[PDB]
Structure formats: structure tokens, C-alpha cells
């Protein structure tokens, strides 16, 4: 199977895609979709009513949905389990076709819809929605399909008189997929990749991404996904976790979210090991405290633009976002001056109404409050100084201005803890202490996700690459730490950042298959004795 | 201009190690006889090895020859917690250099070891496996030579070729995947029943740039140390694999208490694997990263016979699967399902052939089909099952049933018929030469297939014997999750590396398929590097204008 990356559109004035997106945005203005739980083909409502709000205009309820209760989740498990055998018995190509068709739908007739729902529901600007809900999701579907189809070609050696064949079985049981607010594409992949490999899935989408998540779900069903392969089950986090880890039929958890929550689930599975029919497989992507490290030889313009994008795009709400910047003293006057000047030109506003917007409001009231606590800390700490930004206002949307802070302490809590907001901390190091500082990049935090080194000196780049080998699972030389592209930079890291299964690469699907090898022997067997025994 | 330069990757041609015949007057048979004589009356004192240091503790232990337990084949010792922690520290201090070695250079160690085992060291590892674990010539050959050699060669091939799996690059950037070893140390915990498994459990992670504390099986110590010495002689640097026999609980407590644990590669009992899994979960907040647990845990494996089966193949294949190495294989057949129509023929043949099976000393008598079971514990457990068979109204002993531990841990091959398909003996793994047969009415073959699938907690191996294509297809679909290694018209044991990657799910383990191309992927944590070759543009996008 041959596939290439989906083009990223330019959205120029008068372009087909820009006109289409404008219409799709108008289509959502003032609209609230009532999104039910879906079990099989049944639309189910519980009394536990919830609302998704538009981050930049929280008066706009973009969706009304509901939390599945323990009983509904258990029913969804039973129904999914009954559908699994036939789905798993389908040829890999046939399952792949559902995802390739979904990809073509997302590429063409449904592109504007999923972009708009991501913009309005999750607060993304045009380009952030485009690289996510269109390109990344489309690529996940096409590339995973390729990887899966090609995996069936990975076959063992046959020696006469026997034939050996590997059957890439789905896991026996159900998989729980738990997706985060910040990428529409991640939800599609967490539920979709296991379904592709013959699994059945309970998908708990993020509350704050419900609108776009359900849009993806409907596209999958329309593309031919049969009933009970993916159950669409919004739920209270702890309730969902308690329920799926209580089921003897759990065979996997595909999770993206907080370290503590992943650890909790891991411990619940361990507490219940004696109940499960097999050992569940846990996959977790858990975030980072990502660095941009600058050497004195760096191209300053690239450092400035790449760091502004990495730190502030989508309000810094990316597991890969740069939140610690290391600058040599000799370049600090340039970099400080340029950062502060460019900062004043950043437009924060309504991304639907003003395409001039660089980024918009953060996702919800809880994120707003957490980020404000960090800004307040920056106003308190003796080692921290706010250089620009730091304002926030939640009267209309959850608006946080981009903030640039200098720390005199390379080990300050703000240098260690993931904020998930538009908050960049800078540490200025003595030029002659670059090696010691590289060590600090590696040793300071508990995380291992992304990092960038900016330098134009080969020896420095080689040295830094070796030293930072385990500080970043996605490591960048002279580029920003965000924006991994499927099939090009498979994404993930170790240390506290998760299990590193590298979604976006060729091996990720292997977590969702449990292979069986069949040997057929075509000649009758001989005696049980061996000739040497005679 | 590219600051990171990536070398072209090479390929490796390997094939399965040929099984030798050991005919009379043959060089391999003479060499094996000599190696066996070399062990007669000998006790090897086997130290813990940390780096290059041979260390002794006060916890002295002995390995006994299963068929002559008066023979202590090895004296060894259990590493204490202090020594285990010192071994961890030293391994960690050696890890970065080892991880940074080119994959091809690490692979060379295993290819060299494979050649040593194939040629000059073959008789030695075979004899130590025979004498120390009670294997016959052919069981030692397929294990300590063929399988271990194949693990080393095929894993080396898979690893070298894995570096060729690289992402797409598009202007203005170059993308490269670095297959990093795991950051921390791996604990390898190996079982008595295959010398080769210990070599793979410790060796595969080492190949991928990891450092390892290897706790070998007490009852396979002699052969295990031989493998360890060969690896060091083949060029494995110090502190990459620490040879640390230890009390099981103590070992598990120590490794799961280290913040630097990054994996456990385990083969053994279900309860022990679960215990380790729970200890890791308990200590989750202490670890630098999430440890990777791999476990292969045994089975209650079936041979299912359809009325269209070739009777002779059923009999020979079942006798081998049930009784070779005393049935001490995670893949051994312990339940046979036979249709009423073929039961007279099959029963007759099984009983006839049974009377011809020779049990005895595998070193002194090459006519021996299989020998004593591994130890006093195994013997005691099997004895209790034989007694259960006599007591249970649902069970009748058709052949064998006797045992004698006065000289070795000797158990007759035993064939039992159950009238109850759900009898405990149909469900519980015995790890002894005990076959249970259930006879089903021909017209209930479908219902019976459902029973094959549902009766046990395991999913490791199974075989269907049938010459009807429709039936084979049906059974293959019905039994999809009853066996990770499924056999059509062949016995349920004897998977060969590169041909039948081995492992199963349900209670049988994590199914990472050692012997296949993907196993090594559990022991690498890839990093992707993107190098961009042009200055970046503005932070704004054109559509914002």
C-alpha cells in the first residue's frame, strides 16, 4: 500500500479551502449540538448532562452531552465484545478500507467541518486546526493502514514439509481509549489504531473536545465502521477508569493525559490482575517539560521565531511545547530584545472572527486557574521576573496573554513542572559553562519528550546530541520542538513522559496485535523414536 | 550542510542451525560422550559475577543431577541484596558506552558466541544441559545448541536490519530514528527447562544496548554459567550482563526497589509474574521511567483429534509432545481430545507404544526416551496428581502411574482418561509426564471445540489433527485465541526460531513472540532526530495577513 502525507493547505484569500472554512464556521455560530453516548447504533442519554463551551466565548455552549454511568459502560463492553470476533476475522485490508475512506472524507468534503469544530470547540486557530484535525488525523489513518497492511507481509520461514504463517490477531477483550482535549487527531488515533488491528474499543473522548471528537466518530461510522467496534462513551474520568479496570475483559488502555492519572490506571490494573482473562497492555503519552537549548553559534532569527511558535502556538497547550529556553549570555541582549518586540505583535483573540489571531483562549476554567497560579508564582518567586505579558481575563473567554519570564535559578519549580499554558521561562547561562548547562538540561526535569538545540557548529551539535540522548524522544536540530509529522517524526518519549510507543511510526500498531503463528505440516509424522536411540 | 551524518546500514544472512544426528561413530556423538565423561563425578563452583569479579556469599546452594541426585553438579551462591545493588550500580555505569556502540558491533558478540556454541562448545553445553537438567541428547541439542544459537543469530539479524527502518524526510529537513537501549537496567529471570531461554532473556536486551542483571534458574545453573562464560569470551564487555543467581523473592524485591529499573524479562510461573507486576506498580512513583514487563508463563495445551485424522501421526506426535523431557515444557500436550470413532485404534496404539518407552539415565543410555523430572518439588507435585488420579472417580489411569525418587526423580509416563472434561487435571498445569484424554462423541465435535477453548485459563499451544480441509478451517477459526502457537497435523511442542515465533496470550503471558522479528522492539526506546537545514521563517503564517 502506497501513501504520502496530506498536504497542509495555505488558506490564502479567495482559496477554496478558506471559503469552505468560513462557511463551516458560520455553520457553527450560535449552534449547540446534542451529542449522545453511542452504543452500537443506539443513541443513549443519561441524566448526567454536561456542556462543552467555546474557549474564547464561554457563553457559547457548542455541545450538550452526557456522562455514561457504570451500567451503560458495562453494557457498552458487552455489546462490543459480541462484535469483536467477526471484526477480528475480517481481512486486514477490509478493516484498512474503512480508515482509508474516512481519510478521503476528512481530506475533501468533511475538511471544513472538522477544522471548524476544532476551532470553535477547542479554540484552535485555522492553521492549528488544519495540522491537527485534517493533516495529522488523515495521516494517522492512511499511514497506520499502510503499516497494518504491510505487517501481514511480515511472515516467518517455511521449510518443507511445513508451512508457517503469522496471523496478526487483535487483542482478546476490549480496549479503553482515553483521549485529551488538545488534538482532535489524537482521539481518532487512540480509538482508531486499535480498531484497525481488529480490536473493539470504548472511547472516552475529552469533555472539552466533544464536538470535534463526535464529528470524527460519525465520519468513521459513515466510512463503514460497523456497530459496536467503537463505542462513543463520554464519562466522568474516575468512573470510566474504575469501570474499565474492573472488567475481566479489559485487554488494553490507550491513554493520553496526565502522569498521575496514567499511574492511577496502571495501579488499578495491577490491583485487579487476578480478575483479567489476559494481561492488559497499557500505552500512555504523558507530557513533558520541553527545552530549546541555544548555543552562541545559533541563528538568532530562527531561535526567536521557532521559540515563539513552540512556546505559544495553541496557547502552549501541547505535550511538545517549549517551556524552558536556555540562552548563552552573549546572545541574550539580542534574543531578549527580539522576543519582547515580537511579543508585542502577537494577537490573542477570537480565531473564528479574526484570522489575524496568533492564538486564542486556553481550553477551560480549570486550565485558566492553573495557569493563573503559575503567573502568580512568577510574581512571587525571588528568582523569577516577568519580562512581558502575564495578563489574563476570563470575562468573555479564558484568555491568557503569552508570558515570558526570566529565571535566575535553573532548578526553579517553573523550570520543572508542566504548565500547559503560554508561559515561557528563560535561563541565561555563561558562555563558558555551556557543557555544565547541557548537563542541567538533561538532569533538571523528570521528563523526556521533546527538545531542540540551536547551533551552527558541527562539533557542538554532535556533542549536544550525544549528551541529550535520553532528554528527548523527539529531538530537533535547528527547528522548533513542536509539530511532529506522521511518518516523519514518530512521536513520544520516555522518562516520565510515558511508555514511548511512537504513534506516527511503523511499530505503534504492534501494541494492538497479539500474533498467532500457525504451522501446517503436509506429510504424516514418523515414529516417536529418534535414530540416535537405536 | 548536514551536521549529523548517518551511515548506511548493512544486512545479515543467517539460517537455522542444523540439527545433528548423533549416529554411532559420528564426531558429534564421540564429542558428546567425552563431554559427558568430563562431568562425571564433577562439581563446579560457580560464583556470582559482577563486572569481571567472581563473588561468593554465605548462601551456598547446590544444583543436583535430576537422574542421580547424589551428584551435585554445581555449587553456587545467592547474591545478597548488597551485591545485587552493587551489580545494578556497576551495570548503570557501563550502560551509556554500551548503548552508544554501533548495533553491528553489539551483534558481533552474539554472532561470535553463536559460532562457539555451534562448533567447539557444542558438546559442552549439551552435556551440561543433559547432566544438570536431565535432558536426553536430542532435547539438549534442540535447546542448548539449535535454539540458543538461532536466538543469537536471528536476533542479531533482526536488530541490524531494524536500523534500516527509517522515517520519511522532506525538505528542508532530515529525519533519523535512533534505536536507543532503555535507560536503566533490565532484570532477566530465567526458568530451568530451556538453557536457550536464559540466553535469550538476558542476551536479547543486551543486544539492544541494555544492561542486565541475570538471575538464572537454580536447577539449570551449570549450563547457564557455561552460556554466560561463552558470551564473555565472545567479547561481551564487563557489567553488561551481571551473573547473579539469587533467592527469587529477594531478587524481585531488590530490582523492583531500584529507581533505575526499566524492564523485567521473565519466564516462569503466573503467580510470580503477577507478583513482580504488582511490585512495579507499588513502586511506580520511584522509577525514572515506566518499566517494561515481559512474561511467558506456561500453558495447559491441547491436541484435538477429528475423525479424519491420521492415526499414526496422532499417536507419535502426542507421545512426543506429552512425554519428551518429561512433559516439562510450557508447550507440552497435557490434554488429548479424541472422537469415539477413533478411540479404539488410538487407545490401542498409545498403550502399545507406551510399553516401549524407556525411562532412565540419558548420559549412560542413549536409548532413553526421557529421564527424571527436574527436582524434589516437581516430583512431589506430580506424585500428588498421580494420587488424585487414583482417588478421583472421574479419572482412570490407563498406563504408567508409578514413580520412584530413591536414585533420581523418576516418573513413568502416565496416560489418564477423564470422563469429565472439566476435571481439575484438565485445567491445571502439572509440568510432568501426565497426559489426560477425554473422549467425545463424533457428532459433538463443535461443542467439544468450544470446550477446548473455554476449559483452561491458558492460551499457549495447541494442535488439530484432521485431513478434512473444511474442518481444519473451522477449527482454526474457533481456536484462534486458544493457542498462540497453533499446529495443524503436527505436535504442539518444538517451535523453531524464525519459523514459529513462540508465545501465547490469556494467562500464558504478554506474548512478545521471542523467535520472531518484533521481540527486540520491547527492549528499545526509539528517539527520532529531525535536523533542519534552512533558517526558519517568520512566526506568522501567510493566511494571517
Curated annotation (Swiss-Prot), chain B:
Gene source species: Mus musculus (Mouse)
Highest taxon, organism lineage: Eukaryota
Taxonomic placement: Eukaryota, Metazoa, Chordata, Craniata, Vertebrata
Record protein name field: Delta-1-pyrroline-5-carboxylate dehydrogenase, mitochondrial
Active-site feature positions: 296 (proton acceptor), 330 (nucleophile)
Processing and modification events after translation: Acetylation of Lys-81, Lys-96 and Lys-384 is observed in liver mitochondria from fasted mice but not from fed mice.
Family: Belongs to the aldehyde dehydrogenase family.
Residues at which substrate binds: 495
Transmembrane regions: none
E.C. numbers: 1.2.1.88
UniProt keyword annotations, A-Z: Acetylation, Mitochondrion, NAD, Oxidoreductase, Phosphoprotein, Proline metabolism, Transit peptide
Subunit structure: Homodimer.
CDD domains from the UniProt entry: ALDH_F4-17_P5CDH
Gene Ontology CC annotations of this record: cytosol; mitochondrial matrix; mitochondrion
